[PDB]
């Protein structure tokens, strides 16, 4: 099929002190495993390099935020990082980042937990985020627009097939994307401030993503 | 932006 | 469609049909806040919500809401926006105002996309209805009731798109995916609005000011 | 929020 869920799900299963230091330490880390994820996404690796750079530089945060949010469906009040480290609500509040942390927990983590969003649904959402035709500088946004469209057409079919009892499910999923977008930008601000004040060590790959075009 | 380009190559 | 009719959502849109470019844009925003309240009052079940929740939703949504309407209003114009006041802002005026980039984000991400899909007044109304019923909004007495009306609005909108644009199986999703752009732009406009306020050389009216206040 | 509350009521 033109945009198979299975290959998008396969991409999800393939990569699968100061808390802010840990969160920044896990971020740089995931960045490498996000490149590897994207490569395993249908048609992505066939887009021109420049457009592949533009997409990941534009999406990483949302793409990364979604991941940890969905990995954290399991924990009561905290988030689980890929370093195997858990950041608790209270630990994040004690570090002065409780405001955003809570928004991740209620708007993403909780709403993921509520609707028992499966890894396929999560993968296709991230694949929709990955294929953001609104990205600036893209050589071919009409090909990005088409790819995203393939992804979410496949996502409707799956949602109609897997959970046919819930007719509002397909929309409900997409309707976490304005939230992820909001949370991405708020979260990104924090990074820029962690850098400005230089209080927190930021590793090379993470540094590269914050640093100017 | 070095690192990214090197990685988007197998 | 029985509980949240697309005919009445449109009727709320059709009920409210209307020298520094930024100054114009603020005055417009102020005129448009009063109206937005009527529009919302005409959105099925809005009034029935606890008065405080009406306040919250509008304190939260007014931005994407006003920006969604003028973007759709601007499909008829080639390189600017139609403001409710009956004034046009060309992108050159915008650039020559320092607001070039965000205006360009409004031209690319929103207006152009509304035109390239011939988004109608019902689909506008329904997307605005979704933005009004935002269950994320902090402080709500019953976020679930807001979410239930979000469900009702997007159930009706999908049905409408299925019924009146059957040749476009993915139209409904294309409308919903305009919301990250809306949210994302809405936050940038707000960041500017705070700067215009911080810096003291932009005339801000009482309603716009009230909205620009911390909870 | 003086105006909002006033405008919502009547
Ligand atoms: C394993 C995920 C690593 C990861 C990825 C992207 C990110 O934006 C963040 C991140 C989160 C917060 C607030 C906590 C939710 C603050 C600053 C950040 O950089 C972390
Ligand atoms: C009819 C309402 C007009 C209205 C409402 C809310 C807003 O945020 C803006 C707005 C738009 C721009 C960029 C121009 C497209 C920059 C700053 C702004 O404040 C305009």
Residue numbers in the entry:
A (entry chain C): 228 to 243, 262 to 458
B (entry chain D), D (entry chain B): 1 to 10
C (entry chain A): 227 to 244, 262 to 458
From the paper:
RXRα plays its role in diverse physiological processes, including cell development, apoptosis, and homeostasis. As indicated in the previously reported crystal structures of RXRα ligand-binding domain complex with agonists, the essential activation function-2 (AF-2) motif in RXRα exhibits significant conformational changes. AF-2 motif overturns itself to cover the ligand-binding pocket upon agonist binding, thus exposing the surface for recruiting the coactivator SRC1 and initializing the transcription of target genes. The typical chemical structure of RXRα agonist consists of the acidic and hydrophobic moieties to adapt the L-shaped ligand-binding pocket of RXRα. Different from previously reported RXRα agonists, magnolol possesses two identical 5-allyl-2-hydroxyphenyl moieties. To reveal the molecular basis for magnolol binding and activating RXRα, we determine the crystal structure of RXRαLBD-magnolol complex with SRC1 coactivator peptide. Magnolol-bound RXRαLBD exhibits a dimeric packing of RXRα. In RXRαLBD-magnolol structure, the hydroxyl group of magnolol contacts with Asn306 in helix 5 of RXRα. Although magnolol is big enough to accommodate mostly the L-shaped RXRα ligand-binding pocket, two magnolol molecules have to cooperatively occupy the much larger Y-shaped PPARγ ligand-binding pocket. Furthermore, the single bond connecting the two 5-allyl-2-hydroxyphenyl moieties of magnolol endows this chemical compound flexibility to fit the different pocket sizes of RXRα and PPARγ.
Nuclear receptors are ligand-regulated transcription factors, involving multiple signalling pathways, among which RXRα and PPARγ are in the central positions. Once activated by their agonists, RXRα and PPARγ translocate into the nucleus forming RXRα:RXRα homodimer or RXRα:PPARγ heterodimer, which subsequently binds to RXRE or PPRE to initial their target genes transcription, respectively. Interestingly, we find that magnolol is a dual agonist of both RXRα and PPARγ. To reveal the molecular basis for magnolol function, we determine the crystal structures of both RXRαLBD-magnolol and PPARγLBD-magnolol.
